[PDB]
Amino acid sequence: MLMPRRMKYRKQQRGRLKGATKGGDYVAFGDFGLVALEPAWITAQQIEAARVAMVRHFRRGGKIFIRIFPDKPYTKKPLEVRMGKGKGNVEGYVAVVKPGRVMFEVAGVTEEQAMEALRIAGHKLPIKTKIVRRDAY
Amino acid sequence: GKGDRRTRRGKIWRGTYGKYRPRK
Amino acid sequence: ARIAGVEIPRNKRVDVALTYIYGIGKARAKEALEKTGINPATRVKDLTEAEVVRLREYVENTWKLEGELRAEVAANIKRLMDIGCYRGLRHRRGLPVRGQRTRTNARTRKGPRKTVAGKKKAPRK
Amino acid sequence: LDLALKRKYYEEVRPELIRRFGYQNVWEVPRLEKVVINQGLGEAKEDARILEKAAQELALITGQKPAVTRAKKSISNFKLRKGMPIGLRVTLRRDRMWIFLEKLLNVALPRIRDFRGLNPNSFDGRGNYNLGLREQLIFPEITYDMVDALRGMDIAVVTTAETDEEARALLELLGFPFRK
Amino acid sequence: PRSLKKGVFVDDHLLEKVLELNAKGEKRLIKTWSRRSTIVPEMVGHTIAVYNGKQHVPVYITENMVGHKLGEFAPTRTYR
RNA sequence: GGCGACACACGUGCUACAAUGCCCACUACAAAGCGAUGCCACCCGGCAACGGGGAGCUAAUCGCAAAAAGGUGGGCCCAGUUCGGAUUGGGGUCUGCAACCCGACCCCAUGAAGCCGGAAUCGCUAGUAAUCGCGGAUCAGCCAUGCCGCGGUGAAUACG
RNA sequence: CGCCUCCUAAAAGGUAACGGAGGCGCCCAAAGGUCCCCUCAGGCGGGACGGAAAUCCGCCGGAGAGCGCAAGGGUAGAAGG
Secondary structure: OOOOOOOOOOOOOOOOOOOOOOOOOOOOOOOOOEOOOOOEEEEHHHHHHHHHHHHHOOOOOOOEEEOOOOOEOOOOOOOOOOOOOOOOOOOOOEEEEOOOOOOEEEOOOOOOOHHHHHHHHHOOOOOOOOOOOOOOO | OOOOOOOOOOOOOOOOOOOOOOOO | OOOOOOOOOOOOEHHHHHOOOOOOOOOHHHHOOOOOOOOOOOEOOOOOHHHHHHHHHHHHHHOOOOOHHHHHHHHHHHHHHOOOOOOOOOOOOOOOOOOOOOOOOOOOOOOOOOOOOOOOOOOOO | OOOOOHHHHHHHHHHHHHHHOOOOOOOOOOOOOEEEEEEEOOOOOOOOHHHHHHHHHHHHHHOOOOEEEOOOOOOOOOOOOOOOOOEEEEEEOOHHHHHHHHHHHHHHOOOOOOOOOOOOOOEOOOOEEEEEEEOOOOOOOOOOOOOOOOOEEEEEEEOOOOOHHHHOOOHHHHOOOOOO | OOOOOOOOOOOOHHHHHHHHHOOOOOOOOOOOOOOOOOOOOOOOOOOOOOOOOOOOOOOOOOOOOOOOOOOOOOOOOOOO
16 A cells, blocks of 8 residues: 655754765664665655665565654745745655765665665665675674 | 332232241 | 541430441341340430440441442452453453343442433334 | 650660660751641722632640741632732741640541551651642541631641651651551 | 252253263263253363254363353353 | 343323322221132240141131221321332242242342422312222233222312 | 734845735733742552542652743743643
């Protein structure tokens, strides 16, 4: 099924801004590790589209973890010109886009299913995902 | 009370005995 | 004074007064005036402190009343939960626990009339 | 006085400690902490005459004039209208707490809710202890006395005690058997 | 309440069935048909069924009742 | 098991609303019945129910029977009350081979409801109402306050 | 459309705009001058009428409670009761 949502318990105010800020992130906790590309903003809509083939690629399951968080709506008005009212906000929830930001990390299935899985996902967006190891955790 | 008991007022329309009606 | 635990009758003769307690039937009172010799006529308010005491504890000692009665009372009730006896129902089903007719009255163990009905035959009656 | 607790605790509750349990010494043992008494209702400025009277007896019954706590929200709320006052407070720790209780101990007690089988399992976390009740004539002097009255009440004691282990030391120190 | 002091009300076969099992070892349990009779602990937990008009209704045959009748644990009908 | 089932609604009799009410002792009056393999006087165990024993009739001398309301004198303070029974538990009883479902009763502890019930709807002209009373058939034994029946007390009212 | 808080405002101070999340046109004689006093909010727990919450005690915990009504700032050597 599925139809609900997820964007803050309620209103949490309605206005933010911009940057590039060279993002970042710190290592991980799960096995595999997939970094991102390109500094910008993120659409929760993109997230979904990914995990779909991710999973049915994983018939028995697959299994993976995720590191992120929604942040603040958009601006874009329904045509006219410019102001603020109640438009461009409640229709697109974004999160911080750290270049190289650890989007997801991988588990259970080694670089057999995981790998190509990982790809398809990252292989799909407007960027690319990369490797991990151990390191400092 | 005509509809209760442990009295000789209700035991009448019933005709009992007990330690309540005999003699000796 | 207090003959039974936290219990007090007053401004009335002994024969009456007493009868409003737990285990206190219209007869146990008479047993308590022959061996105690106490004359029913005299009111509580005034009476030798012998009668006041040699009776007070005289009672609460001889056996059980309020509380101790009501307890063993419900105990029988619960102890009929053993595995679930027949008269152990009605008990656990808020209903008359000594055979009768559950096709009539007894709004005394249930409660008032919990109505709620609704049969809709054709309008020819 | 000079009797009761005095020539009791100090004459015999001393050798209770001697061998029974080797705590240590006096100055360093559960003597006592304090004596706490209060009340709560709701009714009040229904006319305020409901307040002139309740307050008329409560304190005099106990034999000492305490402090008062009434009036808060003269409107709706959640927990009462009629003024929405409070109750009161009174306290001791001298030969006065000592007198009124000795009388309620072996006298008011007998005339109680089930003699053989007190409640000594209503204990806090250290030297605290709380109990609830409702009476008027349990006053060995004030037997009966103002049926035109009646009302509930709430009292509890406090002790230095290492734990409710020694609050219960006093339970069977003088009686109040564990509800059997 | 109740009546009949001594010889109350029992069966005949029933006298036997218990006897044996509680003479040559607890071992197993059994089953029964129609109703009527008091109880004597010569068969605690050592019970059977009670094929009523419709069908069976067996029980742990607890003591508690001490030596009470059969009414308690032997019921039947519709409901709900 | 079982039509003696229960979420509710109707009929009909039986009771409590109580202070012309109360409860104990002692006291007196009916008719009709109806007693056989049956009615069981009378004493006693029993605090009592019952039970034990036992005579009459041999059937209008023996049985159900003494009585009821009532008289007396003593005891209550409109309180939902010496009011009140639903109501539960307990312990004995007996017909029946035996009573959970459904027996009746002996005694012990239990106190809803209820200060007269809406719109309404029924007997009847005098022994009338109304009330207190005992018996019949049937039933092995029964909640039969049902139904048949005999009397103690004894009103009111009617232009039309 | 005049004013008050705060972001916007790019760390002094300023900074606009059909941007942002919001208030006032009073009340007060005590919420005012002053000398003495306390501590909170609360969390657990012990307990008649207490199902979070009538009320009382003990350990605990620096201000997140509190202070006439929006914010901010302030403040427990309090303005705070």
